[PDB]
Amino acid sequence: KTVRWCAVSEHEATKCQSFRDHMKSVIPSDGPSVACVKKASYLDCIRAIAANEADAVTLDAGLVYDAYLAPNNLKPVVAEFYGSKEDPQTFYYAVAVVKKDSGFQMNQLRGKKSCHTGLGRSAGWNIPIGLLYCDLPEPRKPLEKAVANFFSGSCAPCADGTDFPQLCQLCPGCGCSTLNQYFGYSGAFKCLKDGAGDVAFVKHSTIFENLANKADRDQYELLCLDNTRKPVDEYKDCHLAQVPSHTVVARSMGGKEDLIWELLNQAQEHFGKDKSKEFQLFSSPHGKDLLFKDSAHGFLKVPPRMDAKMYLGYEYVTAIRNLR
Numbered sequence: 001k002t003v004r005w006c007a008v009s010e011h012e013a014t015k016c017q018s019f020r021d022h023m024k025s026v027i028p029s030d031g032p033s034v035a036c037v038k039k040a041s042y043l044d045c046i047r048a049i050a051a052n053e054a055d056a057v058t059l060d061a062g063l064v065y066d067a068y069l070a071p072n073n074l075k076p077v078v079a080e081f082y083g084s085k086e087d088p089q090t091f092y093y094a095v096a097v098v099k100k101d102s103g104f105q106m107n108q109l110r111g112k113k114s115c116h117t118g119l120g121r122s123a124g125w126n127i128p129i130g131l132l133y134c135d136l137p138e139p140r141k142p143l144e145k146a147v148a149n150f151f152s153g154s155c156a157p158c159a160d161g162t163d164f165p166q167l168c169q170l171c172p173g174c175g176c177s178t179l180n181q182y183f184g185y186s187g188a189f190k191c192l193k194d195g196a197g198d199v200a201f202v203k204h205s206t207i208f209e210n211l212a213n214k215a216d217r218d219q220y221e222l223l224c225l226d227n228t229r230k231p232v233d234e235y236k237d238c239h240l241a242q243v244p245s246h247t248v249v250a251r252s253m254g255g256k257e258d259l260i261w262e263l264l265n266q267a268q269e270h271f272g273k274d275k276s277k278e279f280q281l282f283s284s285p286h287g288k289d290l291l292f293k294d295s296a297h298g299f300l301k302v303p304p305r306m307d308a309k310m311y312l313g314y315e316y317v318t319a320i321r322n323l324r
C-alpha cells in the first residue's frame with residue numbers, strides 16, 4: 001500500500017517528492033510506496049493523521065507527547081537512532097551553545113537573548129525552560145509570557161507572536177517550519193551565529209553539523225549546570241539533559257504501522273547513511289533535518305502497541321509534567 005507522509009513546508013515537500021520518486025525507481029510495483037501531503041506546521045500534520053488525511057510524520061519527543069493527548073491520541077511507531085549502526089543511540093543530549101568570552105553562566109541568563117528550536121521541543125524548550133522555571137518572574141503562567149519576560153528578546157518558533165511578541169523578536173512571526181530561517185536545531189544555531197541571540201538551546205551534534213572546521217567551533221562554548229563553561233566537544237560532561245530520540249507517529253486504528261516500518265526499513269537500506277549516490281534519507285541539498293534528522297543513522301521499530309508515555313519513559317514524562 002501507500003504511506004501518506006506529512007511534509008512541513010516547501011523544503012520538506014521537495015525532499016518528500018524525491019523520496020517518492022527514488023523509492024519508485026528501486027522498489028517493485030507491489031512494494032511500499034510513499035505519497036506526500038504538504039502542511040504548514042507539524043500541528044496540522046498531527047490533525048491530518050488523526051483525521052485519516054495522512055499517515056505518518058516524524059516528531060521531536062516533546063511533540064510526540066503532545067500528539068498522544070486527546071483528541072489526536074497518536075502513537076510512536078518507528079524511532080530514529082543516532083551515533084552509528086554499530087552503537088545505536090535512542091537518545092541525544094540537549095545543550096546550551098554560546099559564543100566564547102560572552103561573559104555569562106547558566107545562572108546569569110536573565111536578560112540575555114535566546115534562540116530556541118521551537119515551542120514544546122525537547123532540547124530547545126522543555127529541557128531548558130524546565131531548568132529555568134523557578135528563575136522566571138511571577139506570574140509564571142502562561143509560561144510563554146514568563147519566558148518572554150525573563151529574556152530580553154527571543155526566537156521561539158511556533159509561539160503566538162500576537163500574544164507573546166517578545167518571543168519572536170529574533171525571528172518575526174515565529175514561523176513553525178523551515179520557512180523561518182531560525183526554526184529547528186540549525187535555525188537556532190544560525191540565530192546565535194548571526195548575533196541575534198546570546199544562547200542557542202540545541203543538541204550536541206548541532207554545531208558540528210554547521211561548522212566543519214575546529215578552529216571555527218573553538219569560537220563557541222557550552223553552558224554547564226554547575227555554572228561553568230566547557231568546549232563544545234565536551235557535551236557529555238556539559239549538557240542540560242538526555243532526551244528520547246525523535247519518532248514517527250501514526251494512528252492507533254488503521255494506522256498502517258506495519259507498512260510504515262516496511263517502507264522505512266527498506267528505505268534505510270536503499271538510501272540510508274552512505275548507501276546511495278542518488279538519494280539520502282538523512283541529508284538533503286534542500287536543507288537540514290528535513291523529514292528526519294540529519295544526525296540520524298537509521299530506524300528501529302517501536303515495540304507492539306506502545307503508547308507515547310511508555311515510549312518516552314517516566315523520567316522525560318515527569319520532566320514535561322513538572323514544567324506544566
Ligand SMILES: O=C([O-])C(=O)[O-]
Pocket residue numbers: 060117118121122123124125184185201202
Ligand atoms: O529537540 C529539539 O529542540 C528539536 O528537535 O527541535
Ligand SMILES: [Fe+3]
Pocket residue numbers: 060061121122123246
Ligand atoms: Fe529534538
